[PDB]
Amino acid sequence: DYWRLTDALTVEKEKEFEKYAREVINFESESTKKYAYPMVKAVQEGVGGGRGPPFVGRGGIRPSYQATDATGVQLPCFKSQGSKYNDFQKSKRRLGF
């Protein structure tokens, strides 16, 4: 629970600034919404340098993938179906096991 407590604390500390972040966006988007794009890019970047889908099991953690010689270009998702996994159970009934 000690590391579980710190896990909830990380959720607690990441939240509080998001209120402080949000209220500027609502205050800034009082005249025109034509101009709020960098906020939407900023609050949807994610926790860490990740491009793919968020992992709801681990708490929205976005692990990075930076191992490319001396360049270290982050891996982008070309986007696809991303279908639910076989579980080995779907095919075993598809194959009659």
Partner: protein, 428 residues
């Protein structure tokens, strides 16, 4: 204690390894989150063989994913079990090989071999007693076929005693996707004979033939092809992870197999494959497993054993059974088809039993055997590689990397010396 490190090379290797890491995660009751949700105590007793401990009741696969192209990892990471692998184990680069064995083996591999060597040594020093590593790749690529040979050569010098098993993918002549595929294959098998304890030759076309006929699947994807190879190789170490009526291990099979070090290529076989219509009329019995296995259709290589002589046979079984039929069937098949077995070695059949059945299935069996059929692949490659080298076609790609021309000959010379002595073992 008895640990295995998974080496993962190439787009072929990355996809099949991702498939393999899912079935045993289902077997060991591990969620995509990473924790343990299983019910039986034996589902979590020997999970340290493939997994390493992580805080919060989490386990991480002991894999080293390698490819020369960065986009393959994103497909691996976007996979449903994509958040189960530690990112530091992933090693890759932005410059590929372009199906060139030479570029992977010499030019671009030399900049990446250091980092993967750091990763595998990190995983090697983690476990107290390592039995050996495990690399899966394709011989038709530029990374697994290419620098994957270079990785094997180094770790044999570093760790000679540890076992080195390879579920390598040999290209098919009837269906191929690469013209320099004989070039990479001829420069790869020479690395196999010198540095490999045992190799398993899986052909995708033979896998394609099975689901054409045995499973009658309308549209089986490569994930289905990934499903068979993972199930085949999960049956190799099911006796290792779980106790059985007669226990065995990788070293138990390999020591009981290899009569001479030059011969370590085999065809694997899997028992429980039936189509949907076949499930309606069947009875799960020991002879039906044995009957299905010795039919040459079930086999996932492109060699007919009826044209050669079965050198040795290893037949492991998964699930709770009796040894009455297990011995009575192996004796029956030994005596009936006597001409397909060599006379110099009696009792070529090696048997092992694993009590734990596969998940969601009752009975199963896995078999590894050496026969004189395997040169149907090797010599047929020689019908290509030699008939592509005499005019020096596609050579400037290989010559531009800075190596000589004697290497193609010596790899060819080793391959002709490989078959020739092994021809002699047929008529002995």
């Amino acid at each position: 204690m008895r640990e295995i490190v998974h080496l993962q090379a190439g787009q072929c290797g990355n996809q099949i390894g991702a498939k393999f890491w899912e079935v045993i995660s289902d077997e060991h009751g591990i969620d995509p989150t990473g924790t343990y949700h299983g019910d039986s105590d034996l589902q979590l007793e020997r999970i340290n063989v493939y997994y390493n401990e992580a805080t919060g009741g989490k386990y991480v696969p002991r894999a080293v994913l390698v490819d020369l192209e960065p986009g393959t990892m994103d497909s691996v990471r976007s996979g449903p079990f994509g958040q189960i692998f530690r990112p530091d184990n992933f090693v890759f680069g932005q410059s590929g090989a372009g199906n060139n064995w030479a570029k992977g083996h010499y030019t671009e591999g030399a900049e990446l071999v250091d980092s993967v060597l750091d990763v595998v040594r990190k995983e090697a020093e983690s476990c107290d007693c390592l039995q050996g590593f495990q690399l899966t790749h394709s011989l038709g690529g530029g990374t697994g076929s290419g620098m994957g040979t270079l990785l094997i050569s180094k770790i044999r010098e570093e760790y000679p005693d540890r076992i080195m098993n390879t579920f390598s993918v040999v290209p098919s002549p009837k269906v191929s996707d690469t013209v320099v595929e004989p070039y990479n294959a001829t420069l790869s098998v020479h690395q196999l004979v010198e540095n490999t304890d045992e190799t398993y030759c899986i052909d995708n076309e033979a896998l394609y033939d099975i689901c054409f006929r045995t499973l009658k699947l309308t549209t089986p994807t490569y994930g289905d092809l990934n499903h068979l190879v993972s199930a085949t190789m999960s049956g190799v170490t099911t006796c290792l992870r779980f106790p059985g009526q007669l226990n065995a291990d990788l070293r138990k099979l390999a020591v009981n197999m290899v009569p001479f070090p030059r011969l370590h290529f085999f065809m694997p076989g899997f028992a429980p494959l039936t189509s949907r219509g076949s499930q309606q009329y069947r009875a799960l019995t020991v002879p039906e497993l044995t009957q299905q296995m010795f039919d040459a259709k079930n086999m996932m290589a492109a060699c007919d054993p009826r044209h050669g002589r079965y050198l040795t046979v290893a037949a492991v079984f998964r699930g709770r059974m009796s040894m009455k039929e297990v011995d009575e069937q192996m004796l029956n098949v030994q005596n009936k088809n006597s001409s397909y077995f060599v006379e110099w070695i009696p009792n070529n059949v090696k048997t092992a039993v694993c009590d734990i059945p596969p998940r969601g299935l009752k009975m199963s069996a896995t078999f590894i055997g050496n026969s004189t059929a395997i040169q149907e692949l090797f010599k047929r490659i020689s019908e290509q590689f030699t008939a592509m080298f005499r005019r020096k076609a596609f050579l400037h790609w290989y010559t531009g990397e800075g190596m000589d021309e004697m290497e193609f000959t010596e790899a060819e010379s080793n391959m002709n010396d490989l078959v020739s002595e092994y021809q002699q073992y047929q008529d002995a």
